[PDB]
Enzyme design. Structure first.
Site, PDB file in Angstrom:
ATOM      1  N   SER A 211       0.762  -1.241   0.000  1.00  0.00           N
ATOM      2  CA  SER A 211       0.000   0.000   0.000  1.00  0.00           C
ATOM      3  C   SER A 211       0.802   1.307   0.000  1.00  0.00           C
ATOM      4  O   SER A 211       0.224   2.380  -0.154  1.00  0.00           O
ATOM      5  CB  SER A 211      -1.100  -0.028   1.064  1.00  0.00           C
ATOM      6  OG  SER A 211      -2.076  -1.104   1.019  1.00  0.00           O
TER       7      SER A 211
HETATM    8  C1  CB9 Z   1      -1.970  -2.141   1.854  1.00  0.00           C
HETATM    9  O1  CB9 Z   1      -0.937  -2.546   2.329  1.00  0.00           O
HETATM   10  C2  CB9 Z   1      -3.348  -2.736   2.123  1.00  0.00           C
HETATM   11  N1  CB9 Z   1      -3.319  -4.111   2.630  1.00  0.00           N
HETATM   12  C3  CB9 Z   1      -3.860  -5.078   1.880  1.00  0.00           C
HETATM   13  O2  CB9 Z   1      -3.992  -4.948   0.663  1.00  0.00           O
HETATM   14  C4  CB9 Z   1      -4.402  -6.361   2.543  1.00  0.00           C
HETATM   15  C5  CB9 Z   1      -3.914  -7.590   1.751  1.00  0.00           C
HETATM   16  O3  CB9 Z   1      -2.852  -7.525   1.186  1.00  0.00           O
HETATM   17  O4  CB9 Z   1      -4.648  -8.542   1.704  1.00  0.00           O
HETATM   18  C6  CB9 Z   1      -4.306  -6.635   4.039  1.00  0.00           C
HETATM   19  C7  CB9 Z   1      -3.139  -7.102   4.636  1.00  0.00           C
HETATM   20  C8  CB9 Z   1      -3.110  -7.393   5.995  1.00  0.00           C
HETATM   21  C9  CB9 Z   1      -4.241  -7.244   6.762  1.00  0.00           C
HETATM   22  C10 CB9 Z   1      -5.411  -6.814   6.179  1.00  0.00           C
HETATM   23  C11 CB9 Z   1      -5.447  -6.529   4.823  1.00  0.00           C
HETATM   24  C12 CB9 Z   1      -4.187  -1.761   2.998  1.00  0.00           C
HETATM   25  N2  CB9 Z   1      -3.378  -0.909   3.881  1.00  0.00           N
HETATM   26  C13 CB9 Z   1      -2.956  -1.658   5.071  1.00  0.00           C
HETATM   27  C14 CB9 Z   1      -2.183  -0.722   6.015  1.00  0.00           C
HETATM   28  O5  CB9 Z   1      -1.975   0.408   5.615  1.00  0.00           O
HETATM   29  O6  CB9 Z   1      -1.829  -1.173   7.090  1.00  0.00           O
HETATM   30  C15 CB9 Z   1      -4.293  -2.222   5.658  1.00  0.00           C
HETATM   31  C16 CB9 Z   1      -4.065  -3.494   6.455  1.00  0.00           C
HETATM   32  C17 CB9 Z   1      -5.060  -1.207   6.490  1.00  0.00           C
HETATM   33  S1  CB9 Z   1      -5.287  -2.641   4.152  1.00  0.00           S
END
Ligand code: CB9
Length: 471
Positions: A211
């Site tokens: 992200s």
């Molecule tokens: C970016 O890193 C996002 N995460 C995801 O896309 C998600 C996945 O890859 O399946 C995910 C990972 C771990 C737990 C829940 C979901 C979004 N941003 C992250 C961040 O900034 O921490 C999240 C977890 C809020 S979702």
């Protein structure tokens, strides 16, 4: 016969690698074991006690390379002790005067500086990278790194990597205006001074950025006129090639600010898919993904970056939240150093540079500043990286929690806890990246695990470097 080398110092002249004249104790393990080895003879216990190394340890040291012609027992010993070991007349035991490559910053700079082999040639890091330059003809080296800031960076990282029972971590700190690497630390480290991962993870680990890409997705979509600052997107779960894109934080609608604030996967997926696949491929490239960092360090990778001309709709989406490419932590630091310069892509260096440093404009300044201003939302209430907030300063960060891909291309429930960003957000001076690889102590989100380590490091940096507070 290890001879003196040029001196490696930090940007202000603090010594990190120094050649010191010593008397050293080495064993000729082959010649020692042929001549009766470590027998019942009482002189062996006299050596052990004098070296403060018990016999078992001493036997292990010599039995490792039995036909070897050199193993250190002590890099350094005072005349008194050195004279007493000589007078023991133990066959295979040797005193010699040499130059000891001594590291006064120890395990903190270890990965940057590296060490030398038995013969005295650099085998890792700067020590290898500049070996010829240093050996004599022989030249002092002035690094771009700051020992105070490496000490602060490494100490926060190492601690946090231990607390979260993580496989590893790395923190990279880059000057926004010069492209200089001010700090580059990894946990776990090693002690380069003693007899006793040695690869610099910051240039060799290549990871899916997750992200942390999203600020570049928002930038592309603004330029392509797909959205406007104050635009509002439906962020409800929807289907892309029969795969569900859903958000962790469930929200019906979300502004463009809100998409970076909440870390909306649906939000950025909709922005990607309102554009050709080539757009985010051009912007990530423009920001330096898929491109060498060119620091001359050993094992320095440019990661994996797609050159496919025909993307599926799910591939385009996953690329908008940082899946489908692999980048070094150093590569990610340069992205945020380029965000921080308000769209001026500058080259990196590990040696002090004379400013100014020319850069290439890749995005127009006011376009980037608007998105930097959006990124302030992540460490403000409502945001997912509030734990990184610094008292008396404004910051532009993005959190990330990347799912870790395995040997067989499939995703595990193991995570890269990310926090990247820039400060002060009024007039950025420092880009910082922090990635914790595989936290196994309960919390695993970047906002929960890396955000706080970012806050601690960027706080001390701003204060050490005497930066005028921001609100
Ligand atoms: C970016 O890193 C996002 N995460 C995801 O896309 C998600 C996945 O890859 O399946 C995910 C990972 C771990 C737990 C829940 C979901 C979004 N941003 C992250 C961040 O900034 O921490 C999240 C977890 C809020 S979702």
């Amino acid at each position: 016969v290890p001879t003196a080398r040029g001196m490696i110092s930090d940007r202000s002249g603090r010594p990190l690698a120094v050649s010191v004249p010593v008397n050293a104790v080495w064993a000729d393990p082959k010649e020692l074991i042929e001549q009766g080895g470590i027998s019942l003879d009482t002189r062996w216990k006299a050596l052990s006690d004098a070296l403060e190394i018990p016999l078992d340890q001493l036997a292990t040291r010599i039995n490792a390379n039995p036909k070897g012609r050199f193993v250190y027992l002590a890099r350094q010993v005072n005349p008194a002790i050195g004279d007493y070991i000589r007078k023991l007349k133990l066959p295979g035991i040797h005193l010699r005067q040499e130059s000891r490559r001594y590291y006064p910053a120890g395990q903190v700079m270890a990965h940057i500086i590296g060490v030398t082999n038995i013969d005295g040639q650099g085998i890792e890091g700067v020590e290898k990278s500049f070996d010829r330059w240093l050996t004599g003809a022989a030249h002092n080296l002035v690094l771009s790194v700051d020992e105070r800031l490496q000490a602060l960076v490494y100490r926060e990282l190492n601690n946090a990597v231990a607390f979260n029972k993580a496989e590893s971590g790395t923190a990279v700190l880059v000057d926004v205006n010069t492209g200089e690497v001010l700090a580059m630390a990894n946990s776990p480290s090693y002690n380069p001074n003693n007899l006793t991962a040695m690869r610099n993870r910051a240039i060799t680990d290549i990871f899916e950025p997750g992200s942390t890409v999203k600020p570049m997705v928002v930038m592309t979509a603004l330029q392509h006129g797909v959205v406007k600052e104050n635009s509002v997107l439906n962020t409800l779960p929807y289907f892309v090639n029969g795969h569900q894109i859903k958000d962790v934080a469930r929200y019906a609608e979300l502004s463009v600010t809100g998409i970076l604030q909440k870390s909306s996967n649906v939000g950025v997926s909709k922005l990607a898919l309102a554009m050709p696949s080539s757009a985010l491929v051009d912007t990530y490239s423009r920001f330096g993904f898929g491109k060498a960092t060119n620091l001359g360090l050993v094992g320095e990778s440019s990661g994996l970056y797609p050159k496919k001309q025909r993307w599926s709709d799910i591939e385009r989406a996953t690329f908008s939240f940082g899946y489908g490419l692999m980048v070094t932590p150093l590569q990610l630091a340069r992205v945020y150093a380029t965000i921080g310069s308000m769209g001026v892509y500058r080259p990196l260096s590990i040696t002090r540079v004379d400013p100014p440093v020319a850069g290439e404009r890749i995005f127009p300044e006011p376009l980037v500043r608007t998105v930097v201003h959006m990124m302030e939302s992540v460490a403000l209430p409502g945001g997912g990286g509030t734990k990184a907030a610094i008292k008396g300063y404004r910051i532009a960060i993005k959190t990330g929690t990347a799912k870790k891909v395995g040997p067989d291309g499939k995703y595990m429930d193991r995570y890269l806890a990310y926090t990247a960003g820039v400060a002060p957000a009024s007039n950025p001076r420092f880009a910082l990246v922090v990635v914790i690889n595989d936290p196994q102590a309960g919390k695993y989100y970047g906002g929960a695990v890396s955000a706080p380590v970012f806050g601690a490091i960027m706080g001390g940096v701003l204060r050490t470097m005497n930066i005028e507070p921001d609100a």
